Amino acid sequence: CHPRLSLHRPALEDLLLGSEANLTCTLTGLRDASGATFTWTPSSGKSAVQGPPERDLCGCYSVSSVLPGCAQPWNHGETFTCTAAHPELKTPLTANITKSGNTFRPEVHLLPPPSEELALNELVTLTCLARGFSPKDVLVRWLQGSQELPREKYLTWASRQEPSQGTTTYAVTSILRVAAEDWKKGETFSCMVGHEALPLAFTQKTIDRLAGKPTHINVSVVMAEADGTCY
Amino acid sequence: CHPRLSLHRPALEDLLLGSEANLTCTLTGLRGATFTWTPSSGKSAVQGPPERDLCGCYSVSSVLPGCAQPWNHGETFTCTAAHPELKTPLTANITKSGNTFRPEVHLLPPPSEELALNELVTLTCLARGFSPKDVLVRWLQGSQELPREKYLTWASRQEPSQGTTTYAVTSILRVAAEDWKKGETFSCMVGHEALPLAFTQKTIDRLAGKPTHINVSVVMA
Amino acid sequence: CHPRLSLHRPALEDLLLGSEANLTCTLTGLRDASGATFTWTPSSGKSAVQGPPERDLCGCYSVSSVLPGCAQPWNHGETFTCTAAHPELKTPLTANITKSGNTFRPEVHLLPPPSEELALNELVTLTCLARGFSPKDVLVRWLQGSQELPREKYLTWASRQEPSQGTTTYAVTSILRVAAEDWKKGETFSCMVGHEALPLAFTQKTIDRGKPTHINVSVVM
Numbered sequence A: 001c002h003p004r005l006s007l008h009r010p011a012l013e014d015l016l017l018g019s020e021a022n023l024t025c026t027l028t029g030l031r032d033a034s035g036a037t038f039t040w041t042p043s044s045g046k047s048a049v050q051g052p053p054e055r056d057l058c059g060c061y062s063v064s065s066v067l068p069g070c071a072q073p074w075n076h077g078e079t080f081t082c083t084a085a086h087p088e089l090k091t092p093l094t095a096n097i098t099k100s101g102n103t104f105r106p107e108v109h110l111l112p113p114p115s116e117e118l119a120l121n122e123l124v125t126l127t128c129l130a131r132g133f134s135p136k137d138v139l140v141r142w143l144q145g146s147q148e149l150p151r152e153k154y155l156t157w158a159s160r161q162e163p164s165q166g167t168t169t170y171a172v173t174s175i176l177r178v179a180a181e182d183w184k185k186g187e188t189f190s191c192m193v194g195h196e197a198l199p200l201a202f203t204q205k206t207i208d209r210l211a212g213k214p215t216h217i218n219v220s221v222v223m224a225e226a227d228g229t230c231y
Numbered sequence B: 001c002h003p004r005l006s007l008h009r010p011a012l013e014d015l016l017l018g019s020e021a022n023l024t025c026t027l028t029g030l031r032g033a034t035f036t037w038t039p040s041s042g043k044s045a046v047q048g049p050p051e052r053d054l055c056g057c058y059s060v061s062s063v064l065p066g067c068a069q070p071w072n073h074g075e076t077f078t079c080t081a082a083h084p085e086l087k088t089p090l091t092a093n094i095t096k097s098g099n100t101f102r103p104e105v106h107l108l109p110p111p112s113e114e115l116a117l118n119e120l121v122t123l124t125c126l127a128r129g130f131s132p133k134d135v136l137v138r139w140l141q142g143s144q145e146l147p148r149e150k151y152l153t154w155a156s157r158q159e160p161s162q163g164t165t166t167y168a169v170t171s172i173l174r175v176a177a178e179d180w181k182k183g184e185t186f187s188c189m190v191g192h193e194a195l196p197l198a199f200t201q202k203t204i205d206r207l208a209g210k211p212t213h214i215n216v217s218v219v220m221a
Numbered sequence C: 001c002h003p004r005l006s007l008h009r010p011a012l013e014d015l016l017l018g019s020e021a022n023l024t025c026t027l028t029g030l031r032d033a034s035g036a037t038f039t040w041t042p043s044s045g046k047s048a049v050q051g052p053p054e055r056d057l058c059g060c061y062s063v064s065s066v067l068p069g070c071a072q073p074w075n076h077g078e079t080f081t082c083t084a085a086h087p088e089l090k091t092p093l094t095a096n097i098t099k100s101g102n103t104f105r106p107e108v109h110l111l112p113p114p115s116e117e118l119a120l121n122e123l124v125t126l127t128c129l130a131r132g133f134s135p136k137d138v139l140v141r142w143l144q145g146s147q148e149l150p151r152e153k154y155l156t157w158a159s160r161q162e163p164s165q166g167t168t169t170y171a172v173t174s175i176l177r178v179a180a181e182d183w184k185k186g187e188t189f190s191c192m193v194g195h196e197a198l199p200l201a202f203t204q205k206t207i208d209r210g211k212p213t214h215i216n217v218s219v220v221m
């Protein structure tokens, strides 16, 4: 089973909430091991470490490396190249990666509970859909009141490509199941979405009991001195 | 590589729509073989060919037909194999699972900040709390079924509770605003093992995204 | 005044509920010579299985025989042919049965309760109407919430032929009585119809306490 090589974009959580930028490069298909080297056309500070190999399907040797300190050329839009040189290979390889232009930003929505889950009076669910963004990386975090809930209380699917209406775009969903006492008190829950193309990399939306399928809409308008020598 | 066999349950859409159901026990190994099945029922198994992938070995398979009525009634199957390249030939088994639960389906009306753009509106189906992870999701427009290349459904993950183990799945459909205004109607069907009539349906239109009573008060004082 | 034969169609109930299918060819006419014979065209799994000499009309007793497992050729388009030769009239006479064509899908409506009925606060009444379908074969089922209701709480008529322009279509109705306490509470109800021409074999319709919107606008001086 012949060798192959691939490059990987830096992780999303390490660019929005993180300071360091671990960029990596790997190599699969090897026989047992080697004494490989790696190359990167930017090298001013090349502290490239490798780490030990790992085993693959039916036994196969995979090896990789990493490169730190990469956030500013990534966001400015520089370029990076990788190549391998090891005994069980004839000629070196080649792969590059670049920060993707031609992007879009998500349209976040937050939906109220259905009407039938309000009568069973145990738990209710809140859906958070993000839609139509060009690179496929995204985050979702929930807040309760104004404090963040722990990650083990909700369920987030993966990003998938949606049917075509022009450019190719993606989508993702999530649900939170919350106690039906706090809904009828009047607490508020919020949903945050983090994407590469948004202005400050985060946005949020908020819902409570009095906003959404409310069966009730009051408004009072008071206009005080309507005939009153307006200058 | 390693010699290894599996079995597979019959697929769900063939147990639900079109009654010809199959059953499969494969084999993965050798860098000629025959298989035996324990309930005969006469119309015994065909054996087709060895495709090869996963940087391992060429792998042979086998298929037994006609497994609707014994599978639903609870009959355990076991398909044991035979090869030269094994030490003593392998064996596995499969059953129909019990202690199941059924899902509850929700169709959610579109959000209000989307009707203002006049492009397309989006509908959202949700199914929650069912014990085996097999499910089907089909959309409609009135009575006409829609082709599968028009919408998007996700996988079925596991939802984080404490009592039992349950699962969930979502799906979205985007229709045109001119047809939404006109009064047309759309549905989201869900098929599962545990339902007594194999399907359930929910329905929506441009009404019921309207509130029940409005109170406006203008005070000129 | 003829010792007769019969040929029929498979029953819609278990054709839709999945687990089997059948066909039936009976021989009537007398409680006499029992050289009852039958012969079918294919051999789908097993051949014919014959029962008792059944008691029938005032001395014209009858027999029957039934071919199992005819689901997939029926839904594919087989054109079956019965034959039978008994000695008390030694003519083997044949009859043809095939799956029909030019089907039409029904449309289902569920109508809310009248206003005089709800003011008495005794019970309510729902009504499920099905209209405009080409083969004369239907099923009705009433749910509640998500659980099925038993088949004795409600009533359904037969199926008649509506007169219209050229095209022959049919219609059925059925009604359900319900206490006013749970209709006042909010527990929902549903109606299901099963038909040969529907793509997923069923359609559902729910109802729940279609009320219009109120607009109160007030000006104060």
Ligand SMILES: *[C@@H]1O[C@H](CO)[C@@H](O[C@@H]2O[C@H](CO)[C@@H](O[C@@H]3O[C@H](CO)[C@@H](O)[C@H](O)[C@@H]3O)[C@H](O)[C@H]2NC(C)=O)[C@H](O)[C@H]1NC(C)=O
Residues within 6 Å of the ligand: A079, A081, A095, A096
């Ligand atoms: C970054 O790496 C990519 C490889 O992923 C480089 O793109 C490759 O460019 C070469 C020539 O510049 C392409 O080869 C030629 O393609 C034409 C297509 O018609 C073919 O006729 C020729 O015979 C020859 O094969 C190659 O296809 C292309 N690869 C891909 C995936 O597009 C790219 O140049 C690199 N850029 C930098 C700045 O390093």
Ligand SMILES: *[C@@H]1O[C@H](CO)[C@@H](O[C@@H]2O[C@H](CO)[C@@H](O)[C@H](O)[C@H]2NC(C)=O)[C@H](O)[C@H]1NC(C)=O
Residues within 6 Å of the ligand: B092, B093
């Ligand atoms: C049917 O399959 C089950 C597994 O699905 C087999 O039972 C297990 O066998 C392994 C290895 O022998 C044991 O470690 C487990 O303790 C067994 N039990 C369970 C619950 O996993 C079983 O042997 C098979 N054959 C039968 C029932 O005839």
